[PDB]
């Protein structure tokens, strides 16, 4: 099934943060309404934050995360979790190799903010 795609409330601020756990450089693209709203690029084998920013879901509220290592798209796993019917987490894991640890690039989206 498709992974890394989330529908947030329209015109809503949300945070997006990416961590890296791979020898290779991670390039994370965050799409809002099919348009690149943010890009994070970095390398780390110790869960470093290669990017964190605040974005706005916009009209469609459609947000999609994509990860690639040297142009090659990583396989993704994802899910959305809501706590006490108010706090939202859109979670993404990505695998750029074969060991299937799916942490090479970890992306955490959360909302609402403030």
């Amino acid at each position: 099934a498709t992974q890394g795609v989330f529908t947030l409330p329209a015109n809503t601020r949300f945070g997006v943060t990416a961590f890296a756990n791979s020898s290779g450089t991670q390039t994370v693209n965050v799409l809002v309404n099919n348009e690149t709203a943010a890009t994070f690029s970095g390398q780390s084998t110790n869960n470093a934050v290669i990017g964190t920013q605040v974005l706005n879901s916009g009209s469609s509220g459609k947000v999609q995360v994509q990860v690639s290592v040297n142009g090659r798209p990583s396989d993704l796993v994802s899910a959305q979790v809501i706590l006490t019917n108010e706090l939202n987490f859109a979670l993404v894991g990505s695998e750029d190799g074969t060991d299937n640890d799916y942490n090479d690039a970890v992306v955490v989206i959360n909302w609402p903010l403030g």
Copy 2:
């Protein structure tokens, strides 16, 4: 029910990250084996990362997240999600006031790393 307590596999490196979304200064304390392993303190209404570190679950494997605002303990909400039976996320939300948005201090724990 008890919230903010997580049983991770023993002696395992994990990442812990806190975000702030409140008018009040958040104090996020991370306990491992019931000992303070890290403490983040910060104020923000725009999801600033007031702290992120890589800790080791230790021999016990017990990780607890505590949040307080100026000495007053916040109410916590939490859960753990596992993707593709391998990628783990321990999620924590906290409420320091009366609006119940539970984002005042958001904490995310992820593993495995590397």
Copy 3:
């Protein structure tokens, strides 16, 4: 924090199902827009599916699960998970005692149907 409350898309049908794992008779109430729309009850320590029914979220989309044993409300734990940004599960666990297994009455809400 409040538990057992879920906001479903408006006027959408969903399935609600209850499971029992306790020596005490479980009584599960499902409120839609603050009015009970379904009630299940039974006594099993072998995960018996004590009841299931298709309901409509109505205009409010608000759904709440309440669990009581012999007139006393049980402590609740819950969360919502979304898969492939399409399949929704609203989960509820309940504890009518102190042995901390929170399975005395388990309720699963899923949608969309059809």
Copy 4:
């Protein structure tokens, strides 16, 4: 990524329940320790339960769910959720066609039981 495979505690009882929402007859296979341990077959377009049983996770604890409709393997989506660090949910959604509602056969695994 791999889906429908869950690592439960070993030699532990768990419940597996399947619901159907499709014109096609669903065949749900549950394997334990790499051997089919249970099979549910049924049809429903109203979320009716097509099977529910209590099984043992075997020596490795590995439990795998596979769904097919007339020989054709349905695409799976899944995740595990843990509430209050003790109540577990292994969720599976399956798509036997192209409309991608992933509810054709919905499978819920829960533990502990009793």
